[PDB]
Amino acid sequence: EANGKITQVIGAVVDVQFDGQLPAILNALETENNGKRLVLEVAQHLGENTVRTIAMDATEGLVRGLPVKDTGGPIMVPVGDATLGRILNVVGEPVDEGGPVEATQTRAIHQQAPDFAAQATASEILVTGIKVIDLLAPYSKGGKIGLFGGAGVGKTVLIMELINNIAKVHSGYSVFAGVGERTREGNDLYHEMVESGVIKPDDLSKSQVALVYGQMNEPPGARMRVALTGLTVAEQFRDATGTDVLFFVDNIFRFTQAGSEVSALLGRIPSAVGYQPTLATDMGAMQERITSTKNGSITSIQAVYVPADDLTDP
Amino acid sequence: ANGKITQVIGAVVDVQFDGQLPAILNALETENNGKRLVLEVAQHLGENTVRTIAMDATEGLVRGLPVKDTGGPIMVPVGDATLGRILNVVGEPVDEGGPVEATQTRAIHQQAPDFAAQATASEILVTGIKVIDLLAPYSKGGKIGLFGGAGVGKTVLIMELINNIAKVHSGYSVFAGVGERTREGNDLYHEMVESGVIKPDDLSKSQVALVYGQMNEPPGARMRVALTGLTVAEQFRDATGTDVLFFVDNIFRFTQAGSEVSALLGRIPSAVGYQPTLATDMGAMQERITSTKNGSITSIQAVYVPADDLTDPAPATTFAHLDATTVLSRAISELGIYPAVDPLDSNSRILDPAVVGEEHYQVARDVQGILQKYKSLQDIIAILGMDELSEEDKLTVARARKIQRFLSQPFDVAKVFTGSDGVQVPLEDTIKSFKAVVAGEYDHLPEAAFYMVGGIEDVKAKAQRL
Amino acid sequence: EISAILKDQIKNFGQDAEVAEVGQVLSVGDGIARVYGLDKVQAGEMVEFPGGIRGMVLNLETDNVGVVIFGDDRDIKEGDTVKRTGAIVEVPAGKELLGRVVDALGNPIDGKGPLNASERRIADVKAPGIMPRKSVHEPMATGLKSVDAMIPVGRGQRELIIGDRQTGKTAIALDTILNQANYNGREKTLHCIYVAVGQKRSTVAQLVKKLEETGAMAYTTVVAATASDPAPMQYLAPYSATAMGEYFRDNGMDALIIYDDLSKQAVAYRQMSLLLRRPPGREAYPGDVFYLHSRLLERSAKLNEANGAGSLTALPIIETQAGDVSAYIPTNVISITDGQIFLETELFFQGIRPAVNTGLSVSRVGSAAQTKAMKSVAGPVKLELAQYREMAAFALDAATQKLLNRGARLTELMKQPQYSPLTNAEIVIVIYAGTKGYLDGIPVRDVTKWEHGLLQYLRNQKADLLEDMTKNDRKVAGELEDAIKAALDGYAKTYA
Amino acid sequence: QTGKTAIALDTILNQANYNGREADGMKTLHCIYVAVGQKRSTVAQLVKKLEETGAMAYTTVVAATASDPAPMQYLAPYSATAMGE
Amino acid sequence: GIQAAEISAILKDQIKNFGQDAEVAEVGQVLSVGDGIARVYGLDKVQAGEMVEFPGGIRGMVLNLETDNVGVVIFGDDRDIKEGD
Amino acid sequence: SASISADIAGRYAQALFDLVRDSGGIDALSSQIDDLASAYDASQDLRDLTLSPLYDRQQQEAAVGALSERMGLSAELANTLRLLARNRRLFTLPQFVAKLRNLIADAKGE
Ligand SMILES: Nc1ncnc2c1ncn2[C@@H]1O[C@H](COP(=O)(O)OP(=O)(O)OP(=O)(O)O)[C@@H](O)[C@H]1O
Ligand SMILES: Nc1ncnc2c1ncn2[C@@H]1O[C@H](COP(=O)(O)OP(=O)(O)OP(=O)(O)O)[C@@H](O)[C@H]1O
Ligand SMILES: Nc1ncnc2c1ncn2[C@@H]1O[C@H](COP(=O)(O)OP(=O)(O)O)[C@@H](O)[C@H]1O
Ligand SMILES: [Mg+2]
Ligand SMILES: [Mg+2]
Ligand SMILES: [Mg+2]
């Protein structure tokens, strides 16, 4: 729509001023004249035609005066079968060094949860082919499953097999959102999936999973939005191809931590155990997009970390 | 002069005056709202502007609306005309009985009695409730506090006290509903009509005056209803030179309401988000609730305890204003023992051998002694059990558990839920009964015999029914 | 005066704004929009953003108006046009709402078209005062044996549903709604309002399906501000629903309102308060969190004949953490309502469903407002079941093994499936069976099978008897005794 | 209500024995009771107790009770300290 | 709030305008200093995180780029930095 | 509060007060403030210029210098108003006027 200029840079928070019509809150801004593509998500309208944004990458090197372009919408990432087998970030750039993600379409990572009438009046089991699960604690189609138990108890193998199995018995694909991925473990997860076949580096359409990473070394804003990114990729398979999709979120706790950090940085008075005042809406505006519509469903398995082993923690 | 509204934020309203400023505490009349809206001046902000607190809903106020200075603080009707009537915080009738045609109107703000005018009368007030009379007896024109967490029994207790004291009181009574249940107001109103303490046909014969600002009211109203009620009682204290009863359920709500406006008056918050004026706000109100050489006020104030935390600043600061404290306990109530009075956290400035007598005094200390000993054991009993106590501590446990139950008592006002006829035990009968149990004269009686009875004779009778 | 006027035309900026009825938006973020103008707007007046979204005038300040946005703030920008509506925040109300699913502002979301509301009502009205009311005396039958016998509820009462997550709080609310069909068909109705606050959308969709498939939806209004709706809408939902209930309350009719749940409403309001930078207190909730719920539940009441004899009954739901009923919000509500139904994970995790702790639960005004025939059996049940709860740490002499005998059997009678509320008449019959000994010979493991068989037997053979108990509302009469004697004797014979 | 005030009162009363014993040497001890934030009723009982005992003759009572302004209650202790110095 | 760079001495050079006076792009003047923090006017082109230099030779990192000032954290003893440096 | 307006006023008004004091202005400068204060008491004009939010700082920058007696303001008078506006605080105009007048009184006196 228009070109603005930088007025303030304080850590991961950047204020931008526009001479023209201001970008709505949640719009993606493109900071120009940098080595790497730097994106800014609008957070507030301060007045005096100035907005306050949160940065999706590091802000060292920015100068007051630098030009910024309004993309005209929230962050958009590539969606489609071309994402399967590939590794993506919050803003949809490839982080697997395998070149451009040449999809026909892109979609906004912010979106309203399914309409009331679009909801499914049914409660259906999502058969997994896994005996312990199906018999004793069956997965619900469109539901959320909390995956407890860290490393050494076959988590990664369970994730991979759920992928495989959903593809066999439902023709549905999967999406892994690594929220706060340790780079070491991101490298290993990638090669374990290639080794297990759920990823194929030759036939990208044969791949069954799209990976989205928000690495621990990225700023809070990115770690806060990655789940949405991965959620948006999965919505493509439910709505466009009527499939039953799998959406992995490792770890849901780090999703809340990022939110807490972003909220802290925007100067919002923190709540309960120092969590964001928007704790409930941050979690809820995201989780509600995971459901069974008339067209298909997104089922979600979520690694859950419990602070101080306290189940009553916010 | 007339002023104009510059700002409205909840119950806080700012008003600019072209000429003379209305002093702190003055009542202003907001024009053109449809219904009488009173604003009380809280402070002078400067630039000929004042901050005020509204006594009703501020919805519908518009910047620019005209405001009139009454030339004085909120004034309410007082005298024999208030008896049998129900008023709100700003003196308006809410009983649908027509206007209150008072010969006197009085400001709800007043100086607390002077040191030289203070009374030092120490005389017991017998309630007929065993725990209270024995361990922490009330004092005639003294200040009594009933502390309790949510649904532990504060209201039941205060109602029983009205039933046991206000009934058989010569003088007049004032009940002040502050931030509690309106339907409890409806029940109380119809209960008092039934018993005749209020009469709608002989409004002169009525013995009680009602003032209500319940939890449906906005903060300003709830923050002031207690002053309104206590102002009515001040008249009966002096202007007739008599004894007055003042009942308040729940004075906590006074402090809570003030906490709500303080957040909007621009005060920097104090502990747990409360107003920094918490102690002085309470003090300027509480110090009027007192006996003077002119007359006495016996106050019974129910005190809510946030999250059952007695160190919460509201309740913690209330203790300093009391002559007797009855602390209700959730752990006791859950054991089925009502009233749920903690016998070891309840105190009275009247429990002194020179005031209650050595027998009364000695029996109380003895009961508390054995209960405290039992308490110190309970921790060791929780894991290993009773079989690990000394043959002597087994004995204190036995008597203690019988004493715990003998402190319990069926109330008249609780018949509606218990199904047990209420009982009133005379203080003399309470001391004796408890002395006998302490001395071991009923070690042969089963525990169950002592639970939910009146005097000791009922215990033995029950021990026979079994 | 003299050296003037020339300043006007040289500047020629600001041709003519209309700032009495209109404003423009200085800034927006953290949920609140600050507006220049609106010089004649009222405190608590509804305004309209150029996007068609609604807002409430919260702060009237010297140079601006602070507005709470009923929608996503994403949709408002600096410089947007804002217009006053002249109306204090209000919603549609009336019988045209029954069967329909609406958002917090009263807008349809069911896809059955417009609401067609004739009357409208201010959402934040103060509760009726002392005089217009009178003590509750009409049953509000849940159809749950445990509740209707031991924790009886009355029309106009406020009864709390409290318990940890996954203890069956919502289920109690749903069975209560379904139960009313028995009475609403008669010619003393009970209209229902289910307020979803912060819940999952799927949960509410499944709810409406169930209401629809039972033909209970026809007398029910669903107000939905689910998890993805903005905090201000979740804050408002209950007040709006309450207004819809008041319509019935003030026209000699009766309404039931469920706030599922107030814990989440309170967190939504906390969110609004913290973003407004108001001073946080206990658990970071604003000093006026108590007041948030007090206004609301005080509007549930029983009106006297002079005001039509109508009522509004409230079932507020509260979620505790690991059974912490001393936390701030739970303690707030306990001191607002007229009693509580406590649910326990332990009971649930053991199969006692509904998971009602009859030991803790209370209902003062409701006891006196329960049916005579139920009154005749339920008193002893309460006492006995309690005494059994007092004993059962043993799980002996003679009569003590007898208490564990009845106890376990009576406990099995209090178990109940979902979506199967029972008429008062049926409930007395089954409770009478256990209290009088007619189960003592049965194996505890078969009491549920027995009860289910007994009930289908009564419905199919003795509708008339059931009808008479209902119609007459009687005690256990000598007539009803002889009739009960025959029903159970014959049934027992065919059962074994 | 553990007995804190009581220790201080009895302590004041106790000095009566030594007050007057000047030459014999066992020096006098004058008393100052500063009342801060209390009930006026409490202070009155106190003063009545001292008078009855005839201890008021050697005691100064500085009272800033619950209804007195915060700045008055803040100063009270320093004022009495000066009287002590 | 007032904000920095609204000071009597600083506002002179903004309105007066000397010869080649500007240099607000690559140079600045300390508005305020304390506790290892120097608020600096000017330096319009300095980058977030850039290491700048005080007249004493001391280094400092630009961590805060604000509308009318730069917040610099000092790698040294702040006694050697004063207003106007 | 409003007292906060004086803090800026004291500075902004002092900035120019110094330039005229040392270089040369006080005498003739008094008139500039006198005439300026006279135009500010055109209620309709004054308010519209100073207090209401008119969005564009550019729109209000030139407008300020223009509304003043294109005549009775020395270089500094034009420079100050613009800069004051540029900072989004030209609204504090009276707060500074009264301050400047006092500066003269101090420079005069007894
Ligand atoms: N003396 C008693 N005997 C038997 N039951 C009692 C007694 N007192 C209270 N209860 C029970 O405990 C509950 C609490 O009653 P009450 O209305 O006094 O609560 P409360 O804590 O006083 O409320 P509030 O905070 O409004 O003062 C009621 O359900 C009542 O049945
Ligand atoms: N040694 C004692 N023997 C008998 N009674 C005592 C003794 N000491 C104190 N008491 C009694 O304990 C009661 C409370 O003591 P005190 O007057 O010191 O209150 P306090 O501990 O200062 O608490 P508060 O701060 O609430 O006044 C008094 O009424 C007093 O009679
Ligand atoms: N009467 C009952 N019998 C069997 N299961 C029940 C009953 N009531 C509730 N449940 C179970 O409890 C679970 C949660 O119910 P819900 O009412 O949603 O509780 P909450 O509202 O506390 O989450 C459901 O899985 C349901 O099957
Ligand atoms: Mg009460
Ligand atoms: Mg629920
Ligand atoms: Mg003391």
Side-chain angles (χ1 to χ4, degrees), chain B residues 319-322 347-353 361 365, chain D residues 1-10 33 38-39 42 46:
Chain B
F319 290 100
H321 299 126
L322 300 173
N347 270 107
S348 168
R349 303 186 66 250
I350 265 201
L351 188 49
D352 181 313
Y361 183 77
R365 294 296 168 246
Chain D
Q1 300 287 297
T2 52
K4 298 187 307 301
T5 299
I7 292 175
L9 178 38
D10 286 13
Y33 182 83
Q38 297 146 321
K39 285 163 275 150
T42 301
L46 211 329

Side-chain angles (χ1 to χ4, degrees), chain D residues 29-46:
Chain D
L29 195 71
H30 306 90
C31 300
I32 303 176
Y33 182 83
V34 188
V36 181
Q38 297 146 321
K39 285 163 275 150
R40 259 168 202 174
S41 52
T42 301
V43 186
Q45 307 302 313
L46 211 329

Side-chain angles (χ1 to χ4, degrees), chain B residues 2-23:
Chain B
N2 290 19
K4 302 184 177 185
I5 294 177
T6 47
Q7 299 189 65
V8 178
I9 316 292
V12 178
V13 179
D14 293 345
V15 188
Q16 173 167 61
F17 282 86
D18 287 48
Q20 191 179 40
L21 273 334

Side-chain angles (χ1 to χ4, degrees), chain C residues 396-413:
Chain C
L396 265 66
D397 45 74
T400 44
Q401 301 170 325
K402 189 72 254 175
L403 302 181
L404 278 78
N405 275 18
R406 222 60 149 295
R409 285 176 195 119
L410 218 68
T411 289
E412 290 299 311
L413 280 187

Side-chain angles (χ1 to χ4, degrees), chain A residues 154-179:
Chain A
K155 188 196 285 193
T156 56
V157 171
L158 184 60
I159 291 166
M160 292 194 292
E161 190 78 343
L162 282 169
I163 290 156
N164 182 82
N165 284 12
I166 293 297
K168 264 72 182 194
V169 302
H170 309 298
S171 311
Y173 295 134
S174 298
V175 183
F176 172 70
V179 180

Side-chain angles (χ1 to χ4, degrees), chain C residues 38-200:
Chain C
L38 300 172
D39 296 0
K40 304 303 301 187
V41 82
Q42 298 165 284
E45 187 173 318
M46 194 70 83
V47 291
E48 283 185 292
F49 306 124
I53 297 168
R54 300 285 178 284
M56 168 176 66
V57 168
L58 184 53
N59 289 223
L60 295 184
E61 284 146 327
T62 54
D63 66 333
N64 84 89
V65 180
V67 181
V68 244
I69 304 158
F70 293 125
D72 300 313
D73 39 22
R74 178 260 294 277
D75 301 305
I76 292 155
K77 309 173 283 287
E78 153 169 22
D80 277 3
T81 307
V82 190
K83 40 157 75 102
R84 69 180 285 247
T85 67
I88 303 332
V89 170
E90 53 184 7
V91 299
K95 294 203 172 191
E96 38 275 317
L97 288 84
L98 304 165
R100 311 202 87 254
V101 185
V102 299
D103 72 5
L105 284 165
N107 316 92
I109 63 174
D110 54 19
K112 278 103 173 169
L115 205 75
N116 310 11
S118 54
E119 190 181 312
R120 296 186 73 82
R121 244 191 213 266
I122 295 99
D124 216 329
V125 294
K126 190 203 293 180
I130 299 165
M131 295 310 304
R133 296 142 92 110
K134 184 63 202 295
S135 302
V136 176
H137 87 275
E138 284 147 72
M140 204 274 80
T142 65
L144 295 170
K145 289 164 281 178
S146 309
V147 176
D148 289 349
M150 288 180 274
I151 317 89
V153 194
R155 294 185 184 197
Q157 188 178 346
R158 293 78 50 71
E159 182 71 359
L160 174 58
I161 284 59
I162 180 175
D164 302 335
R165 183 183 38 72
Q166 292 186 293
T167 50
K169 293 190 301 316
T170 302
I172 295 198
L174 185 36
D175 284 20
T176 304
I177 293 172
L178 298 179
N179 192 55
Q180 307 316 307
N182 300 63
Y183 306 94
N184 296 354
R186 216 171 206 79
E187 297 174 34
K188 75 209 217 310
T189 191
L190 192 60
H191 293 97
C192 300
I193 298 109
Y194 183 95
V195 181
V197 186
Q199 304 195 64
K200 299 224 295 249

